[PDB]
């Protein structure tokens, strides 16, 4: 089942060589590659490089999924008021797309992640549903 811990597991399974390849490659932005910044920070975390990872995640403190990854995976304590956890479905969907492109996981796991994303945004009638449906159809 597509998830945050299953994503880190694939980064473990990729190997130290493929990790450093993804480290050096994801540091530079690419057009039409959402979740590149978040995947970069997770690469540094599976490579034991906590100090660089925390600097990367601080530059992303506006994204709630980037805040949750900084606290529960990079050990950064919250300075703000205690907030309820965020929906990770859409970020996990983008993270799974890049992992499938890099041939680290099957394309079908990106399809399950994009389907579950559509399901979660539908259960609360999100105004960004059509946006995600366009992305799901384009990536999958």
CSV table of N, CA, C and O in Angstrom, one decimal, residues 11-139:
chain,number,residue,atom,x,y,z
A,11,UNK,N,13.7,3.8,-0.9
A,11,UNK,CA,14.9,4.6,-0.8
A,11,UNK,C,16.0,3.8,-0.1
A,11,UNK,O,17.2,4.0,-0.5
A,12,UNK,N,15.7,2.9,0.8
A,12,UNK,CA,16.6,2.0,1.5
A,12,UNK,C,17.0,0.9,0.5
A,12,UNK,O,18.2,0.7,0.3
A,13,UNK,N,16.0,0.3,-0.1
A,13,UNK,CA,16.2,-0.8,-1.1
A,13,UNK,C,17.0,-0.4,-2.4
A,13,UNK,O,17.5,-1.2,-3.0
A,14,UNK,N,17.0,0.9,-2.7
A,14,UNK,CA,17.6,1.5,-3.9
A,14,UNK,C,19.2,1.3,-3.9
A,14,UNK,O,19.8,1.2,-5.0
A,15,UNK,N,19.7,1.4,-2.7
A,15,UNK,CA,21.2,1.3,-2.5
A,15,UNK,C,21.9,2.6,-2.3
A,15,UNK,O,21.3,3.7,-2.8
A,16,UNK,N,23.1,2.6,-1.8
A,16,UNK,CA,23.9,3.8,-1.5
A,16,UNK,C,24.3,4.6,-2.7
A,16,UNK,O,24.3,5.8,-2.7
A,17,UNK,N,24.6,3.8,-3.8
A,17,UNK,CA,25.0,4.4,-5.1
A,17,UNK,C,23.8,5.2,-5.7
A,17,UNK,O,24.0,6.4,-6.0
A,18,UNK,N,22.6,4.5,-5.8
A,18,UNK,CA,21.4,5.2,-6.3
A,18,UNK,C,20.9,6.3,-5.4
A,18,UNK,O,20.2,7.2,-5.9
A,19,UNK,N,21.2,6.2,-4.1
A,19,UNK,CA,20.8,7.3,-3.2
A,19,UNK,C,21.6,8.5,-3.5
A,19,UNK,O,21.0,9.6,-3.6
A,20,UNK,N,22.9,8.4,-3.6
A,20,UNK,CA,23.8,9.6,-3.9
A,20,UNK,C,23.5,10.1,-5.3
A,20,UNK,O,23.7,11.3,-5.5
A,21,UNK,N,23.1,9.2,-6.3
A,21,UNK,CA,22.7,9.7,-7.6
A,21,UNK,C,21.5,10.6,-7.5
A,21,UNK,O,21.5,11.7,-8.1
A,22,UNK,N,20.4,10.1,-6.7
A,22,UNK,CA,19.2,10.9,-6.4
A,22,UNK,C,19.5,12.1,-5.5
A,22,UNK,O,18.7,13.1,-5.6
A,23,UNK,N,20.6,12.1,-4.7
A,23,UNK,CA,21.0,13.2,-3.9
A,23,UNK,C,21.4,14.4,-4.8
A,23,UNK,O,20.9,15.5,-4.7
A,24,UNK,N,22.4,14.1,-5.6
A,24,UNK,CA,23.1,15.1,-6.5
A,24,UNK,C,22.2,15.6,-7.7
A,24,UNK,O,22.3,16.7,-8.1
A,25,UNK,N,21.2,14.7,-8.1
A,25,UNK,CA,20.2,15.0,-9.2
A,25,UNK,C,19.0,15.8,-8.7
A,25,UNK,O,18.6,16.8,-9.4
A,26,UNK,N,18.4,15.5,-7.5
A,26,UNK,CA,17.2,16.2,-7.1
A,26,UNK,C,17.5,17.6,-6.5
A,26,UNK,O,16.5,18.4,-6.3
A,27,UNK,N,18.8,18.0,-6.2
A,27,UNK,CA,19.2,19.3,-5.7
A,27,UNK,C,18.8,20.5,-6.7
A,27,UNK,O,18.5,21.6,-6.3
A,28,UNK,N,18.8,20.2,-8.0
A,28,UNK,CA,18.5,21.1,-9.1
A,28,UNK,C,17.0,20.9,-9.5
A,28,UNK,O,16.6,19.8,-9.9
A,29,UNK,N,16.2,22.0,-9.6
A,29,UNK,CA,14.8,21.9,-10.0
A,29,UNK,C,14.7,21.5,-11.5
A,29,UNK,O,15.5,21.9,-12.4
A,30,UNK,N,13.6,20.8,-11.8
A,30,UNK,CA,13.2,20.4,-13.2
A,30,UNK,C,11.7,20.8,-13.5
A,30,UNK,O,10.9,20.8,-12.5
A,31,UNK,N,11.4,21.3,-14.7
A,31,UNK,CA,10.0,21.7,-14.9
A,31,UNK,C,9.1,20.5,-15.1
A,31,UNK,O,9.4,19.6,-15.8
A,32,UNK,N,8.0,20.6,-14.4
A,32,UNK,CA,7.0,19.5,-14.3
A,32,UNK,C,7.3,18.4,-13.5
A,32,UNK,O,7.0,17.2,-13.8
A,33,UNK,N,8.0,18.6,-12.3
A,33,UNK,CA,8.5,17.6,-11.4
A,33,UNK,C,8.2,18.1,-10.0
A,33,UNK,O,9.1,18.5,-9.2
A,34,UNK,N,6.9,18.0,-9.6
A,34,UNK,CA,6.5,18.4,-8.3
A,34,UNK,C,6.8,17.3,-7.3
A,34,UNK,O,6.6,16.1,-7.6
A,35,UNK,N,7.3,17.7,-6.1
A,35,UNK,CA,7.7,16.7,-5.1
A,35,UNK,C,9.2,16.4,-5.1
A,35,UNK,O,9.6,15.4,-4.5
A,36,UNK,N,9.9,17.1,-6.0
A,36,UNK,CA,11.4,16.9,-6.1
A,36,UNK,C,12.1,17.4,-4.9
A,36,UNK,O,13.1,16.8,-4.5
A,37,UNK,N,11.7,18.5,-4.3
A,37,UNK,CA,12.3,19.1,-3.1
A,37,UNK,C,12.1,18.2,-1.9
A,37,UNK,O,13.0,18.0,-1.2
A,38,UNK,N,10.9,17.6,-1.8
A,38,UNK,CA,10.5,16.7,-0.7
A,38,UNK,C,11.3,15.4,-0.8
A,38,UNK,O,11.8,14.9,0.2
A,39,UNK,N,11.4,14.8,-2.0
A,39,UNK,CA,12.1,13.6,-2.3
A,39,UNK,C,13.6,13.7,-2.0
A,39,UNK,O,14.2,12.8,-1.5
A,40,UNK,N,14.1,14.9,-2.3
A,40,UNK,CA,15.5,15.2,-2.1
A,40,UNK,C,15.9,15.1,-0.6
A,40,UNK,O,16.9,14.5,-0.2
A,41,UNK,N,15.0,15.7,0.3
A,41,UNK,CA,15.2,15.8,1.8
A,41,UNK,C,15.1,14.4,2.4
A,41,UNK,O,15.8,14.1,3.3
A,42,UNK,N,14.2,13.5,1.8
A,42,UNK,CA,14.0,12.1,2.2
A,42,UNK,C,15.2,11.2,1.8
A,42,UNK,O,15.5,10.2,2.5
A,43,UNK,N,15.9,11.6,0.8
A,43,UNK,CA,17.2,10.9,0.3
A,43,UNK,C,18.3,11.2,1.3
A,43,UNK,O,18.9,10.2,1.7
A,44,UNK,N,18.4,12.4,1.7
A,44,UNK,CA,19.4,12.9,2.7
A,44,UNK,C,19.2,12.2,4.1
A,44,UNK,O,20.1,11.9,4.8
A,45,UNK,N,17.9,12.0,4.4
A,45,UNK,CA,17.5,11.3,5.7
A,45,UNK,C,17.8,9.8,5.7
A,45,UNK,O,18.2,9.3,6.7
A,46,UNK,N,17.6,9.1,4.5
A,46,UNK,CA,18.0,7.7,4.4
A,46,UNK,C,19.5,7.5,4.2
A,46,UNK,O,20.0,6.4,4.4
A,47,UNK,N,20.2,8.6,3.9
A,47,UNK,CA,21.7,8.6,3.7
A,47,UNK,C,22.3,9.1,5.0
A,47,UNK,O,23.5,9.5,5.0
A,48,UNK,N,21.6,9.1,6.1
A,48,UNK,CA,22.1,9.5,7.5
A,48,UNK,C,22.4,11.0,7.6
A,48,UNK,O,22.6,11.4,8.7
A,49,UNK,N,22.4,11.8,6.5
A,49,UNK,CA,22.7,13.2,6.4
A,49,UNK,C,21.5,14.0,7.0
A,49,UNK,O,20.8,14.7,6.2
A,50,UNK,N,21.3,14.0,8.3
A,50,UNK,CA,20.3,14.7,9.0
A,50,UNK,C,20.4,16.3,9.0
A,50,UNK,O,19.4,16.9,8.7
A,51,UNK,N,21.6,16.8,9.2
A,51,UNK,CA,21.9,18.2,9.1
A,51,UNK,C,21.5,18.9,7.8
A,51,UNK,O,20.8,19.9,7.8
A,52,UNK,N,21.9,18.3,6.6
A,52,UNK,CA,21.6,18.9,5.3
A,52,UNK,C,20.0,18.7,5.1
A,52,UNK,O,19.4,19.7,4.6
A,53,UNK,N,19.4,17.6,5.5
A,53,UNK,CA,18.0,17.3,5.4
A,53,UNK,C,17.1,18.3,6.1
A,53,UNK,O,16.2,18.8,5.5
A,54,UNK,N,17.5,18.7,7.3
A,54,UNK,CA,16.8,19.7,8.2
A,54,UNK,C,16.8,21.1,7.6
A,54,UNK,O,15.8,21.8,7.7
A,55,UNK,N,17.9,21.5,6.9
A,55,UNK,CA,18.1,22.7,6.2
A,55,UNK,C,17.2,22.8,5.0
A,55,UNK,O,16.5,23.8,4.8
A,56,UNK,N,17.1,21.7,4.2
A,56,UNK,CA,16.2,21.5,3.1
A,56,UNK,C,14.7,21.6,3.4
A,56,UNK,O,14.0,22.3,2.7
A,57,UNK,N,14.3,21.0,4.6
A,57,UNK,CA,13.0,20.9,5.0
A,57,UNK,C,12.5,22.3,5.6
A,57,UNK,O,11.3,22.6,5.6
A,58,UNK,N,13.5,23.0,6.2
A,58,UNK,CA,13.2,24.4,6.7
A,58,UNK,C,12.8,25.3,5.6
A,58,UNK,O,11.9,26.2,5.8
A,59,UNK,N,13.4,25.2,4.4
A,59,UNK,CA,13.2,26.0,3.2
A,59,UNK,C,11.8,25.6,2.7
A,59,UNK,O,11.2,26.3,1.8
A,60,UNK,N,11.1,24.5,3.2
A,60,UNK,CA,9.8,24.0,2.7
A,60,UNK,C,8.7,24.1,3.9
A,60,UNK,O,7.6,23.5,3.7
A,61,UNK,N,9.0,24.8,5.0
A,61,UNK,CA,8.2,24.9,6.2
A,61,UNK,C,6.7,25.4,5.9
A,61,UNK,O,5.9,25.4,6.7
A,62,UNK,N,6.5,25.9,4.6
A,62,UNK,CA,5.1,26.3,4.2
A,62,UNK,C,4.2,25.1,3.9
A,62,UNK,O,3.0,25.2,4.0
A,63,UNK,N,4.9,24.0,3.4
A,63,UNK,CA,4.1,22.7,3.1
A,63,UNK,C,3.9,21.9,4.4
A,63,UNK,O,4.9,21.6,5.1
A,64,UNK,N,2.7,21.5,4.7
A,64,UNK,CA,2.3,20.8,5.9
A,64,UNK,C,2.9,19.3,5.9
A,64,UNK,O,3.2,18.8,6.9
A,65,UNK,N,3.1,18.7,4.7
A,65,UNK,CA,3.6,17.4,4.5
A,65,UNK,C,5.2,17.5,4.9
A,65,UNK,O,5.7,16.7,5.6
A,66,UNK,N,5.8,18.6,4.4
A,66,UNK,CA,7.2,18.9,4.7
A,66,UNK,C,7.4,19.2,6.2
A,66,UNK,O,8.5,19.0,6.7
A,67,UNK,N,6.4,19.7,6.9
A,67,UNK,CA,6.5,20.0,8.3
A,67,UNK,C,6.4,18.7,9.1
A,67,UNK,O,7.2,18.6,10.0
A,68,UNK,N,5.5,17.8,8.7
A,68,UNK,CA,5.3,16.5,9.3
A,68,UNK,C,6.6,15.6,9.1
A,68,UNK,O,6.9,14.8,10.1
A,69,UNK,N,7.2,15.6,8.0
A,69,UNK,CA,8.5,14.9,7.6
A,69,UNK,C,9.7,15.5,8.5
A,69,UNK,O,10.6,14.7,8.8
A,70,UNK,N,9.6,16.8,8.8
A,70,UNK,CA,10.7,17.4,9.6
A,70,UNK,C,10.6,17.0,11.0
A,70,UNK,O,11.6,16.8,11.7
A,71,UNK,N,9.4,16.8,11.5
A,71,UNK,CA,9.1,16.5,12.9
A,71,UNK,C,9.3,15.0,13.3
A,71,UNK,O,10.0,14.7,14.2
A,72,UNK,N,8.6,14.2,12.6
A,72,UNK,CA,8.5,12.7,12.9
A,72,UNK,C,9.6,11.9,12.1
A,72,UNK,O,9.6,10.7,12.4
A,73,UNK,N,10.4,12.5,11.3
A,73,UNK,CA,11.4,11.7,10.5
A,73,UNK,C,12.8,12.4,10.7
A,73,UNK,O,13.8,11.7,10.7
A,74,UNK,N,12.8,13.8,10.8
A,74,UNK,CA,14.1,14.6,10.9
A,74,UNK,C,14.3,15.1,12.3
A,74,UNK,O,15.3,15.8,12.6
A,75,UNK,N,13.4,14.8,13.2
A,75,UNK,CA,13.5,15.1,14.7
A,75,UNK,C,13.4,16.5,15.1
A,75,UNK,O,13.6,16.8,16.3
A,76,UNK,N,13.0,17.4,14.2
A,76,UNK,CA,12.8,18.8,14.5
A,76,UNK,C,11.6,19.1,15.3
A,76,UNK,O,10.5,18.7,14.9
A,77,UNK,N,11.7,19.7,16.5
A,77,UNK,CA,10.6,19.9,17.4
A,77,UNK,C,9.8,21.1,16.9
A,77,UNK,O,10.4,22.1,16.4
A,78,UNK,N,8.5,21.1,17.0
A,78,UNK,CA,7.6,22.2,16.6
A,78,UNK,C,7.8,23.4,17.5
A,78,UNK,O,7.9,23.3,18.7
A,79,UNK,N,7.8,24.6,16.9
A,79,UNK,CA,7.9,25.9,17.5
A,79,UNK,C,6.5,26.6,17.6
A,79,UNK,O,6.3,27.3,18.5
A,80,UNK,N,5.7,26.2,16.6
A,80,UNK,CA,4.3,26.7,16.5
A,80,UNK,C,3.3,26.0,17.4
A,80,UNK,O,3.8,25.2,18.2
A,81,UNK,N,2.0,26.4,17.4
A,81,UNK,CA,1.0,25.7,18.2
A,81,UNK,C,0.7,24.3,17.7
A,81,UNK,O,0.8,24.1,16.5
A,82,UNK,N,0.3,23.3,18.6
A,82,UNK,CA,0.1,22.0,18.1
A,82,UNK,C,-1.0,21.8,17.0
A,82,UNK,O,-2.2,22.1,17.3
A,83,UNK,N,-0.6,21.4,15.8
A,83,UNK,CA,-1.6,21.3,14.7
A,83,UNK,C,-1.9,19.8,14.5
A,83,UNK,O,-1.1,18.9,14.7
A,84,UNK,N,-3.2,19.6,14.0
A,84,UNK,CA,-3.7,18.3,13.7
A,84,UNK,C,-2.9,17.7,12.4
A,84,UNK,O,-2.5,18.6,11.6
A,85,UNK,N,-2.7,16.4,12.3
A,85,UNK,CA,-1.8,15.9,11.2
A,85,UNK,C,-2.4,16.2,9.8
A,85,UNK,O,-3.7,16.3,9.6
A,86,UNK,N,-1.6,16.3,8.7
A,86,UNK,CA,-2.1,16.6,7.4
A,86,UNK,C,-2.4,15.4,6.5
A,86,UNK,O,-1.9,14.3,6.7
A,87,UNK,N,-3.2,15.6,5.4
A,87,UNK,CA,-3.5,14.6,4.4
A,87,UNK,C,-2.2,14.5,3.6
A,87,UNK,O,-1.6,15.6,3.2
A,88,UNK,N,-1.7,13.3,3.4
A,88,UNK,CA,-0.4,13.1,2.7
A,88,UNK,C,-0.6,12.5,1.3
A,88,UNK,O,0.3,12.5,0.5
A,89,UNK,N,-1.9,12.0,1.0
A,89,UNK,CA,-2.3,11.3,-0.2
A,89,UNK,C,-1.7,11.9,-1.5
A,89,UNK,O,-1.1,11.1,-2.3
A,90,UNK,N,-1.9,13.2,-1.8
A,90,UNK,CA,-1.4,13.9,-3.0
A,90,UNK,C,0.2,13.9,-3.1
A,90,UNK,O,0.7,13.7,-4.1
A,91,UNK,N,0.9,14.3,-1.9
A,91,UNK,CA,2.3,14.3,-1.9
A,91,UNK,C,2.9,12.9,-2.1
A,91,UNK,O,3.8,12.8,-2.9
A,92,UNK,N,2.3,11.9,-1.5
A,92,UNK,CA,2.7,10.5,-1.6
A,92,UNK,C,2.5,10.0,-3.0
A,92,UNK,O,3.3,9.2,-3.5
A,93,UNK,N,1.5,10.6,-3.7
A,93,UNK,CA,1.2,10.3,-5.2
A,93,UNK,C,2.3,10.8,-6.1
A,93,UNK,O,2.7,10.1,-7.0
A,94,UNK,N,2.8,12.1,-5.8
A,94,UNK,CA,3.9,12.7,-6.6
A,94,UNK,C,5.2,12.0,-6.3
A,94,UNK,O,6.0,11.7,-7.2
A,95,UNK,N,5.5,11.7,-5.0
A,95,UNK,CA,6.7,11.0,-4.6
A,95,UNK,C,6.8,9.7,-5.2
A,95,UNK,O,7.9,9.3,-5.6
A,96,UNK,N,5.6,8.9,-5.4
A,96,UNK,CA,5.6,7.6,-6.0
A,96,UNK,C,5.7,7.7,-7.5
A,96,UNK,O,6.3,6.7,-8.1
A,97,UNK,N,5.4,8.8,-8.1
A,97,UNK,CA,5.6,9.0,-9.6
A,97,UNK,C,7.1,9.1,-9.9
A,97,UNK,O,7.5,8.4,-10.9
A,98,UNK,N,7.9,9.9,-9.2
A,98,UNK,CA,9.3,10.1,-9.4
A,98,UNK,C,10.0,8.8,-9.1
A,98,UNK,O,11.0,8.4,-9.8
A,99,UNK,N,9.6,8.0,-8.1
A,99,UNK,CA,10.2,6.7,-7.8
A,99,UNK,C,9.9,5.6,-8.9
A,99,UNK,O,10.8,4.8,-9.1
A,100,UNK,N,8.8,5.7,-9.6
A,100,UNK,CA,8.4,4.8,-10.7
A,100,UNK,C,9.3,5.2,-12.0
A,100,UNK,O,9.7,4.3,-12.7
A,101,UNK,N,9.5,6.5,-12.2
A,101,UNK,CA,10.2,7.1,-13.3
A,101,UNK,C,11.7,6.7,-13.2
A,101,UNK,O,12.3,6.4,-14.2
A,102,UNK,N,12.3,6.8,-12.0
A,102,UNK,CA,13.6,6.4,-11.7
A,102,UNK,C,13.8,4.9,-11.6
A,102,UNK,O,14.9,4.4,-11.4
A,103,UNK,N,12.7,4.1,-11.9
A,103,UNK,CA,12.6,2.6,-12.0
A,103,UNK,C,12.9,2.0,-10.6
A,103,UNK,O,13.5,0.9,-10.6
A,104,UNK,N,12.6,2.6,-9.5
A,104,UNK,CA,12.8,2.2,-8.2
A,104,UNK,C,11.6,1.4,-7.6
A,104,UNK,O,11.7,0.6,-6.6
A,105,UNK,N,10.4,1.6,-8.2
A,105,UNK,CA,9.1,0.9,-7.8
A,105,UNK,C,8.2,0.7,-9.0
A,105,UNK,O,8.5,1.4,-10.1
A,106,UNK,N,7.2,-0.2,-9.0
A,106,UNK,CA,6.3,-0.3,-10.2
A,106,UNK,C,5.4,0.9,-10.5
A,106,UNK,O,5.0,1.5,-9.5
A,107,UNK,N,5.0,1.1,-11.7
A,107,UNK,CA,4.1,2.1,-12.2
A,107,UNK,C,2.7,2.0,-11.5
A,107,UNK,O,2.1,3.0,-11.2
A,108,UNK,N,2.3,0.7,-11.2
A,108,UNK,CA,1.0,0.4,-10.6
A,108,UNK,C,0.9,1.0,-9.2
A,108,UNK,O,-0.2,1.3,-8.8
A,109,UNK,N,2.1,1.2,-8.4
A,109,UNK,CA,2.0,1.7,-7.1
A,109,UNK,C,1.7,3.3,-7.1
A,109,UNK,O,1.2,3.8,-6.2
A,110,UNK,N,2.1,3.9,-8.3
A,110,UNK,CA,1.8,5.3,-8.5
A,110,UNK,C,0.3,5.5,-8.8
A,110,UNK,O,-0.3,6.4,-8.3
A,111,UNK,N,-0.2,4.5,-9.5
A,111,UNK,CA,-1.7,4.4,-9.9
A,111,UNK,C,-2.6,4.2,-8.7
A,111,UNK,O,-3.6,4.9,-8.5
A,112,UNK,N,-2.1,3.4,-7.7
A,112,UNK,CA,-2.9,3.2,-6.5
A,112,UNK,C,-2.8,4.5,-5.6
A,112,UNK,O,-3.9,4.9,-5.1
A,113,UNK,N,-1.7,5.1,-5.5
A,113,UNK,CA,-1.4,6.4,-4.8
A,113,UNK,C,-2.3,7.5,-5.4
A,113,UNK,O,-2.9,8.3,-4.6
A,114,UNK,N,-2.4,7.6,-6.7
A,114,UNK,CA,-3.2,8.7,-7.4
A,114,UNK,C,-4.7,8.3,-7.3
A,114,UNK,O,-5.5,9.3,-7.2
A,115,UNK,N,-5.1,7.1,-7.2
A,115,UNK,CA,-6.5,6.7,-7.0
A,115,UNK,C,-6.9,7.1,-5.6
A,115,UNK,O,-7.9,7.8,-5.5
A,116,UNK,N,-6.1,6.6,-4.6
A,116,UNK,CA,-6.4,6.9,-3.2
A,116,UNK,C,-6.4,8.5,-2.9
A,116,UNK,O,-7.2,8.9,-2.2
A,117,UNK,N,-5.6,9.2,-3.7
A,117,UNK,CA,-5.5,10.7,-3.6
A,117,UNK,C,-6.9,11.3,-4.0
A,117,UNK,O,-7.4,12.1,-3.3
A,118,UNK,N,-7.4,10.7,-5.1
A,118,UNK,CA,-8.7,11.2,-5.7
A,118,UNK,C,-9.8,10.9,-4.7
A,118,UNK,O,-10.7,11.7,-4.5
A,119,UNK,N,-9.8,9.7,-4.1
A,119,UNK,CA,-10.7,9.2,-3.1
A,119,UNK,C,-10.8,10.1,-1.9
A,119,UNK,O,-11.9,10.6,-1.5
A,120,UNK,N,-9.6,10.5,-1.3
A,120,UNK,CA,-9.5,11.3,-0.1
A,120,UNK,C,-10.0,12.8,-0.4
A,120,UNK,O,-10.7,13.4,0.5
A,121,UNK,N,-9.7,13.4,-1.5
A,121,UNK,CA,-10.1,14.7,-1.9
A,121,UNK,C,-11.6,14.7,-2.2
A,121,UNK,O,-12.2,15.8,-2.1
A,122,UNK,N,-12.2,13.6,-2.6
A,122,UNK,CA,-13.6,13.5,-2.9
A,122,UNK,C,-14.4,13.4,-1.7
A,122,UNK,O,-15.6,13.9,-1.7
A,123,UNK,N,-13.9,12.8,-0.6
A,123,UNK,CA,-14.6,12.6,0.7
A,123,UNK,C,-14.9,13.9,1.4
A,123,UNK,O,-15.7,14.0,2.4
A,124,UNK,N,-14.2,15.0,1.0
A,124,UNK,CA,-14.4,16.3,1.7
A,124,UNK,C,-14.6,17.5,0.6
A,124,UNK,O,-14.5,18.6,1.0
A,125,UNK,N,-15.1,17.0,-0.6
A,125,UNK,CA,-15.4,17.9,-1.7
A,125,UNK,C,-14.4,19.0,-2.0
A,125,UNK,O,-14.8,20.2,-2.2
A,126,UNK,N,-13.1,18.7,-2.0
A,126,UNK,CA,-12.0,19.6,-2.3
A,126,UNK,C,-12.1,20.3,-3.6
A,126,UNK,O,-12.5,19.7,-4.6
A,127,UNK,N,-11.9,21.7,-3.6
A,127,UNK,CA,-12.0,22.5,-4.8
A,127,UNK,C,-10.8,22.3,-5.8
A,127,UNK,O,-10.9,22.7,-7.0
A,128,UNK,N,-9.8,21.5,-5.3
A,128,UNK,CA,-8.6,21.2,-6.1
A,128,UNK,C,-8.7,19.7,-6.7
A,128,UNK,O,-7.7,19.1,-7.0
A,129,UNK,N,-9.9,19.1,-6.7
A,129,UNK,CA,-10.1,17.8,-7.2
A,129,UNK,C,-9.8,17.7,-8.7
A,129,UNK,O,-9.0,16.8,-9.1
A,130,UNK,N,-10.4,18.5,-9.5
A,130,UNK,CA,-10.2,18.6,-11.0
A,130,UNK,C,-8.7,18.7,-11.4
A,130,UNK,O,-8.3,18.2,-12.4
A,131,UNK,N,-7.9,19.5,-10.5
A,131,UNK,CA,-6.5,19.7,-10.7
A,131,UNK,C,-5.7,18.4,-10.6
A,131,UNK,O,-4.9,18.1,-11.4
A,132,UNK,N,-6.0,17.6,-9.5
A,132,UNK,CA,-5.5,16.3,-9.2
A,132,UNK,C,-5.9,15.3,-10.2
A,132,UNK,O,-5.0,14.5,-10.7
A,133,UNK,N,-7.1,15.3,-10.7
A,133,UNK,CA,-7.7,14.4,-11.7
A,133,UNK,C,-6.9,14.6,-13.1
A,133,UNK,O,-6.6,13.6,-13.7
A,134,UNK,N,-6.6,15.8,-13.4
A,134,UNK,CA,-5.8,16.2,-14.6
A,134,UNK,C,-4.3,15.6,-14.4
A,134,UNK,O,-3.8,15.2,-15.4
A,135,UNK,N,-3.8,15.7,-13.2
A,135,UNK,CA,-2.4,15.2,-12.9
A,135,UNK,C,-2.4,13.7,-12.9
A,135,UNK,O,-1.5,13.1,-13.5
A,136,UNK,N,-3.4,13.0,-12.3
A,136,UNK,CA,-3.5,11.6,-12.2
A,136,UNK,C,-3.6,11.0,-13.7
A,136,UNK,O,-2.9,10.1,-14.0
A,137,UNK,N,-4.4,11.7,-14.6
A,137,UNK,CA,-4.5,11.3,-15.9
A,137,UNK,C,-3.3,11.5,-16.8
A,137,UNK,O,-3.0,10.6,-17.6
A,138,UNK,N,-2.5,12.5,-16.4
A,138,UNK,CA,-1.2,12.9,-17.2
A,138,UNK,C,-0.1,12.0,-16.7
A,138,UNK,O,0.7,11.6,-17.6
A,139,UNK,N,0.1,11.8,-15.4
A,139,UNK,CA,1.2,11.0,-14.9
A,139,UNK,C,1.0,9.5,-15.1
A,139,UNK,O,1.8,8.8,-15.7
